[PDB]
Amino acid sequence: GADRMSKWTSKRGPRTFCKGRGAKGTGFHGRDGKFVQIKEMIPELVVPELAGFKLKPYVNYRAPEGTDTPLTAKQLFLETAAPAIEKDFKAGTFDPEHLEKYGFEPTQEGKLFQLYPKNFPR
Amino acid sequence: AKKGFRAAYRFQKELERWRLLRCPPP
Amino acid sequence: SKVTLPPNYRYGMSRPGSLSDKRKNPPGTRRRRVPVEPISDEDWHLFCGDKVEILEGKDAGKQGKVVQVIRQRNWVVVEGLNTHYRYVGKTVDYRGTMIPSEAPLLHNQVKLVDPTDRKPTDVEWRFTEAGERVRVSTRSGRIIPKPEFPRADGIVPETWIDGPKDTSVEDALEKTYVPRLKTLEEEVMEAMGIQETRRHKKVYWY
Amino acid sequence: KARGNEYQPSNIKRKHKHGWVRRLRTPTGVQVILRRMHKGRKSLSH
Amino acid sequence: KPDKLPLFKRQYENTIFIGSKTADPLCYGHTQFHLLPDKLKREKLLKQNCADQIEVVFRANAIASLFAWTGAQAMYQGFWSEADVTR
Amino acid sequence: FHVRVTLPPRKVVDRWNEKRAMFGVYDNIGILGNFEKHPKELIKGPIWLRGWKGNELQRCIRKKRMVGNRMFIDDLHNLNKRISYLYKHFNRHGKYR
Amino acid sequence: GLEEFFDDPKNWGEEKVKSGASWTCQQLRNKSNEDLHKLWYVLLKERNMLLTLEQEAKRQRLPMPSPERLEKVVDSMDALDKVVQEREDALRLLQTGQEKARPGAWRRDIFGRIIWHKFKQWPIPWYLNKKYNRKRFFAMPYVERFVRMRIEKQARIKARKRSLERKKEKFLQEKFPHL
Amino acid sequence: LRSRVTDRYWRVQEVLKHARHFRGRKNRCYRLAVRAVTRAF
Amino acid sequence: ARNVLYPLYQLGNPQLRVFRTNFFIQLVRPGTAQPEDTVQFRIPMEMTRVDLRNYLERIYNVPVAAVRTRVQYGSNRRRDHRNIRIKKPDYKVAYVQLALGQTFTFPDLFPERKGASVDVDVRDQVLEDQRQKHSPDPRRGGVPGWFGL
RNA sequence: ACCAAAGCUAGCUCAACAUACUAAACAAAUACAAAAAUACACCAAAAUAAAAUAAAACAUUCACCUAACAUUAAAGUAUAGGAGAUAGAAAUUUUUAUCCUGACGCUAUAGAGAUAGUACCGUAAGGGAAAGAUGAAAGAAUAAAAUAAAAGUAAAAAAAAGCAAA
RNA sequence: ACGAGCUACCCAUGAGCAGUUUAAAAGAACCAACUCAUCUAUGUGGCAAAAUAGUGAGAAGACUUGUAGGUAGAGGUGAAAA
RNA sequence: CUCGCACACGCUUACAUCAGUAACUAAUAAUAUACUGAUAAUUAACAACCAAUAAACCAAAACAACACUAAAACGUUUAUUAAUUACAUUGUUAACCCAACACAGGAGUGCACCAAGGAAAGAUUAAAAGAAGUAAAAGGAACUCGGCAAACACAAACCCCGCCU
Ligand SMILES: [Mg+2]
Ligand SMILES: [Mg+2]
Ligand SMILES: [Mg+2]
Ligand SMILES: [Mg+2]
Ligand SMILES: [Mg+2]
Ligand SMILES: [Mg+2]
Ligand SMILES: [Mg+2]
Ligand SMILES: [Mg+2]
Ligand SMILES: [Mg+2]
Ligand SMILES: [Mg+2]
Ligand SMILES: [Mg+2]
Ligand SMILES: [Mg+2]
Ligand SMILES: [Mg+2]
Ligand SMILES: [Mg+2]
Ligand SMILES: [Mg+2]
Ligand SMILES: [Mg+2]
Ligand SMILES: [Mg+2]
Ligand SMILES: [Mg+2]
Ligand SMILES: [Mg+2]
Ligand SMILES: [Mg+2]
Ligand SMILES: [Mg+2]
Ligand SMILES: [Mg+2]
Ligand SMILES: [Mg+2]
Ligand SMILES: [Mg+2]
Ligand SMILES: [Mg+2]
Ligand SMILES: [Mg+2]
Ligand SMILES: [Mg+2]
Ligand SMILES: [Mg+2]
Ligand SMILES: [Mg+2]
Ligand SMILES: [Mg+2]
Ligand SMILES: [Mg+2]
Ligand SMILES: [Mg+2]
Ligand SMILES: [Mg+2]
Ligand SMILES: [Mg+2]
Ligand SMILES: [Mg+2]
Ligand SMILES: [Mg+2]
Ligand SMILES: [Mg+2]
Ligand SMILES: [Mg+2]
Ligand SMILES: [Mg+2]
Ligand SMILES: [Mg+2]
């Protein structure tokens, strides 16, 4: 009576049953019944130049660690936006209506990589 | 496991009897 | 790599993921639960590397060094004091290397020893005015410092030579971060000059 | 003739009769799945 | 092994064909003409990073087709494995 | 019939502990306390068993009447089955009639 | 450039290979984003080499020379992924304030449970989708008995766990009367 | 309150001490010993 | 990247770019005979041929010509002590063939040392000599030879 | 002398208190043939519980029978019933707050089925097990210490005659 | 509640029937593949919870048979054997 | 002595190499495709996945010339718009499946009767009874309920009951 505990896999079924193993599709089916692959769906790998870059995958044993402070939204605000806001308020040029000069963005859909929809994979 | 001391002591008496039967004392 | 143990299990000074422990207990067996008195981590005052004294056994009054502690069964191991004598080199035609092995000791046979007078003294954890947690004796009223011991890796940070794949301390502690409100995505894309003009269409989420 | 071989295996028939989708198209099959979950089954269906 | 080319084993009927049957009186030939398909274009090879493959594909096409057709001529002419080839 | 081969550890139980020394202290709370509280509310136990005694059928009926809306699904079904079986056995079966 | 999968040839026949410590989170926080982007590939090539060496040691029936290097490397990968995730979710908390990267809803499925249903990307809306309307997110009236029985079962399980811990405390206090 | 009989060894031995000299399975099996001891008495 | 939700593609969307790769690659010695142009890799489930080609072309700068993949199935026959089937994990094997006639032969990653072999042979001879010394004299007949007289 | 035997633990059972009630994990994929990123839709629904039983049969009837209203009495009362079996109120009354919670419940054929709804039997709904015993240390296996007591065998086949014994 | 993956009957979609006799692909004839199971002998805790050997009937049709779907028990289905 | 090779369905690593088998699997050994451990493997061109919207269409497949009745599966061009751009995903092992079993049973399709597959006897002796086969003087159904079975025969007639397949 078959195997219930075994995972349902394309290796198990007939020629009709063809299931992917988790890869991402890169195209569609074209005019002649062939597969037309879209270059836009291909993940273009982004690599830097590592020849003129000096760092190593292992850390010196005598190099000390640090007190673990996780990055906080309050700390990021106090480090990035707070000097500009404080300088503009002490100079009298602070504008509560427009905050685009301090790094704030009202709507995400203008820019290329959104945050809440998570437009970028990695 | 059975709760009881009487069975254990009564078996110890039989164990002493069996030991005396097996190896007789001088 | 973390090894998951069965819920009821017995400790016998072997490493739980080791071949000696696999020979001792196979995965298909279980043994009786030993009564282990719970000692909290803020109450456990015995560490490894400091001088203790044995009170009970074949030897009494001797002093030695703690090399291993077994926390789960509440054991301390003294170095070569409580001995039983075993063979290691084993083949058919030859036996050799009779080695002293040391039996485990639980906490009731051990009091911690103050460095001055070399007597056993009851020890409590106290909080001083400097914010550090230092053990304090009952009788002598001295504080006992912590036993700085070598680690399991066997590598001291004082004497070390960097390999071809090791980062220097200066490059490790060098700060290059500029905390700006752009993502790593935007930073690397503008850093290498990748230019993209078009934008994504509307994508619905349910 | 000879018996014992009433089970002629077919994955199409198996997944169409006892499949997850076939269980969830009917409220009675849904209640079957809830009974298997209450019992704590490793495999709720085929 | 020939599987590493890649080549794959398949089973169907064994046919030896000249382009006609045996009763056709024209059991010899003059020339062949072979068009390259879309997948084997020079532009496709340069996209696939293939320099000498342009010559290799033409070589393989000729070596396969002309040998198969000359063997077809030889076996409609009655020559086979233990008769070898007279001319 | 194989009995154990070792003597067990003898249970050193003391007759003078806190519970055995203070057992049944206020049993005469009404008698020596100008009757204000009965010995009923010294009983620590279930809600339906405090100061009450009966056979198994009356016990099950009383449990279903007091804490019946707070029992479990399977326990309530089992108690209903036990009530039905005890009713049938106590009424329709017996010797002395 | 296929030799980067292997070590340098001087180190092939050595039983013990010393290496430095894993990358610490506080050391990751001091670097810039381009530094993290380059360090990811620097770690990636070393991890590929270590996995290749692990597979070859499994193949030739010899122990892997100091296999803790792979553990240190994967710890470094976890640390760098973690600090990038701190930078991203902190920056998203400043810009939008949404806690999660993926949209989702707390839903009542047909089974009676409460499920955090994550959303998916579709080119067409929800009412027009053929696949989505045959999904059901609600509980029928017959499901309530099974929901109650699930509650009853977990209540019994925690009741026995609490009584078990109480019994173990009693047994230890009776076993060792040091008080 | 679960109660079990612990002296069952002595219970069977008080019968089997009178049947040690029998032939067959009556000197060992307790079911066959009781009927043999009864007829003997 | 693996284990990450991917952007939906309609007409006119920008280029999908992956910056920190979640894939990890094993380079394995073939158990069977393979030609000179072929290099064998173990890759995860979610790889395509174009993904591995871009991986080798950009990260490692290898001029590959052809990529052919297959999925190898792990054994689920083996049973535990409590008789639940233990499954070896399935993996993916990819064969690449190089373009410019580049030659790859698998190097010997474990060369034995002559000095280490000589030291091991000397230790084995010392152990055999210790066993020969520990072998009792047959003419003693089991009498312990510790005592002088 | 083999086969065997012995442990005291894992854990359950009944309550009480109690917040207030579908645990944990959710990075990805999950109701395409579940665990398969990606296309013009359809979506959804309710209708009294019945019978085995008792009335020694069985037709009207047959307490509980998955609808919260508790206790002391009225009261097994008035009533309803092939006025048979049986069913059965109400009007009217009593109930002092918290702590003092653990066990004249079990110890591996017992206590939950549970080491587990897992192996295994079933197409499916479903049914559903048995299985542990050394010590402080086995990083003391030329390893040591306590029963050698069930049926079954061996040590040790049988010698006229008979419920096998007296 | 679950069952038409065996079987009873339908809806789709396919695949097989060589030789011989005849103006015939005629619910004709001989006989294979194929489908049933007439008779006998073994088997009866068996090779088998219905089989083996010999012998038999049809074999261009109201024939077998692959895949898949449908009809569900106060019922389905039935060239009625309850 | 001759159920072979492959595909579809179904099984799920049981396949291949090395090493071991005191014991576990083969209803017994030898050893190993059926046990144990480690390591590898099946690479697409074959197969799956692989456009609709309107319109001209009565005229069978049976070597199809042309016919019969039971009236018959199987697609073209015309127009409209169909992302245009190397390399997508998936099945590639086996002595295998359903029968509690390494079961004399069941099992669809394409080409073959061998160029491929295999072994009825573990070793003796040759008693009775039992199964299978061959042969038989003279007789030829006298046996039996019945010419059941067997046989160098393999034919010719009369009834009963149902027309027949
Ligand atoms: Mg099954
Ligand atoms: Mg398949
Ligand atoms: Mg297949
Ligand atoms: Mg293509
Ligand atoms: Mg069956
Ligand atoms: Mg493939
Ligand atoms: Mg009646
Ligand atoms: Mg009756
Ligand atoms: Mg009723
Ligand atoms: Mg009336
Ligand atoms: Mg009457
Ligand atoms: Mg009232
Ligand atoms: Mg049990
Ligand atoms: Mg005996
Ligand atoms: Mg006599
Ligand atoms: Mg059906
Ligand atoms: Mg059918
Ligand atoms: Mg014919
Ligand atoms: Mg005919
Ligand atoms: Mg005929
Ligand atoms: Mg029939
Ligand atoms: Mg036959
Ligand atoms: Mg015959
Ligand atoms: Mg015929
Ligand atoms: Mg009917
Ligand atoms: Mg009839
Ligand atoms: Mg009849
Ligand atoms: Mg199987
Ligand atoms: Mg054997
Ligand atoms: Mg094959
Ligand atoms: Mg024989
Ligand atoms: Mg004979
Ligand atoms: Mg004969
Ligand atoms: Mg004859
Ligand atoms: Mg004759
Ligand atoms: Mg006659
Ligand atoms: Mg005949
Ligand atoms: Mg005749
Ligand atoms: Mg005749
Ligand atoms: Mg007829």
For C38 and J137, how far is CA from C1' in angstroms? 21
Contact A24, I46 (CB under 8 A): yes
DSSP tag of G127: T
**Domain annotation covers residue C91:** yes
Instruction: Judge residue G153's burial from the number of C-beta atoms within 10 Å of its C-beta, 0-12 exposed, 13-18 middle, 19 or more buried.
Output: middle
Kindly list the residues from chain H whose CB atom is less than 8 angstroms away from the CB atom of residue B2: 4, 6
Q: Which strand ranges, in their side-by-side order, compose the sheet holding I64-72?
A: I26-27, I38-43, I91-98, I64-72
3-state SS, residue C66: strand
Contact G46, G22 (CB under 8 A): no
Ligand with an atom nearest the CA of residue D17: 16
To which residue do tokens 């010393």 refer? Answer: G18
3-state SS, residue I106: coil
Token pair in block for residue G117:
């249903």
Contact A8, D45 (CB under 8 A): no
Cβ of D14 near strand K (under 7 Å)? The reply is: yes
A with I: touching (≥3 Cβ pairs within 8 Å): yes
| Out of I20, I58, I73, closest to residue A11 by CB | I73
For I90 and L12, how far is CA from C1' in angstroms? 13
Q: Give the ranges where chain F is alpha helix by DSSP (H).
A: 18-21, 56-66, 73-92
If you count them, how many residues does chain B have?
A: 26
Token pair in block for residue G114:
């409460």
Identify the closest residue of chain F to G150 by CA–CA distance. Answer: F73
Query: Cβ of A26 under 8 Å from any chain I Cβ?
Result: yes
Q: How many alpha carbons fall within 13 Å on the CB side of residue G63?
A: 8
Cα–Cα distance measured from residue C107 to residue E57, given in angstroms and rounded to the nearest whole number: 81
Angle formed at CA G95 by CA G90 and CA G97, multiple of 5 degrees: 70
How were these coordinates obtained?
A: cryo-EM
The CATH number of I1-149 is 3.30.70.330
Instruction: Judge residue A60's burial from the number of C-beta atoms within 10 Å of its C-beta, 0-12 exposed, 13-18 middle, 19 or more buried.
Output: buried
Contact E57, E51 (CB under 8 A): no
**Domain annotation covers residue C161:** no
**Max Cα-Cα span within chain G:** 73
Domain that holds residue D37: 1-46
CATH number at residue D32: 1.10.287.3980
Q: How many alpha carbons fall within 13 Å on the CB side of residue H10?
A: 11
Tell me how many domains chain C contains. 1
Instruction: Give the number of beta-carbon pairs within 8 Å between D and G.
Output: 21
Provide the sign of the torsion angle of the four alpha carbons F64, F69, F73, F75, taken in this order.
Answer: negative
Q: For chain A, positions 53-92, list CB contacts with chain I under 8 A.
A: none
Q: How many alpha carbons fall within 13 Å on the CB side of residue H11?
A: 9
State the resolution, in angstroms. 3.5
3-state SS, residue G24: coil
Following DSSP, what letter does each residue of C72-132 receive, concatenated? TTTEEEESSSSEEEEEEEE-SS-EEEEEEEE--EEGGGEEEB-TTT--B--EEEEE-TTS-
F with B: touching (≥3 Cβ pairs within 8 Å): yes
Cβ of D19 near strand K (under 7 Å)? The reply is: no
Q: Which of B15, I82, C35, I19 is nearest to F3 (CA)?
A: B15
Alpha carbon distances (Å) from C79 to C45, C64, C97, D17, G107: 18, 6, 18, 69, 61
How many angstroms separate the alpha carbon of residue E67 from the centre of ligand 40? 68
CA H25 from centroid of its chain's CA atoms: 12
3-state SS, residue G51: helix
Contact F82, F67 (CB under 8 A): no
Q: Residue E1: which nucleotide is closest by CA–C1'?
A: L43
Contact A9, A2 (CB under 8 A): no
Q: How many alpha carbons fall within 13 Å on the CB side of residue C166?
A: 15
Token pair in block for residue I20:
């920190």
Q: Which residues contact E33 (CB under 8 A, 6 or more apart)?
A: none
Ramachandran region, residue C57 (left: φ > 0; alpha: ψ -120 to 50; beta: rest)? left
Give the containing element (helix H, strand E) for C133: strand C133-137
Q: Which of A121, C189, A115 is nearest to G89 (CA)?
A: A115
Cα–Cα distance measured from residue E40 to residue E38, given in angstroms and rounded to the nearest whole number: 6
Contact G42, C166 (CB under 8 A): no
**Domain annotation covers residue C75:** yes
Contact G51, G6 (CB under 8 A): no
Q: Residue D31: which nucleotide is closest by CA–C1'?
A: K1
Cα–Cα distance measured from residue H16 to residue F1, given in angstroms and rounded to the nearest whole number: 14
How many angstroms separate the alpha carbon of residue D7 from the centre of ligand 22? 25
Q: Which residues contact C73 (CB under 8 A, 6 or more apart)?
A: C11, C34, C36, C104, C106
Cα–Cα distance measured from residue H18 to residue C103, given in angstroms and rounded to the nearest whole number: 54
Alpha carbon distances (Å) from G14 to A39, C32, C166: 46, 45, 18
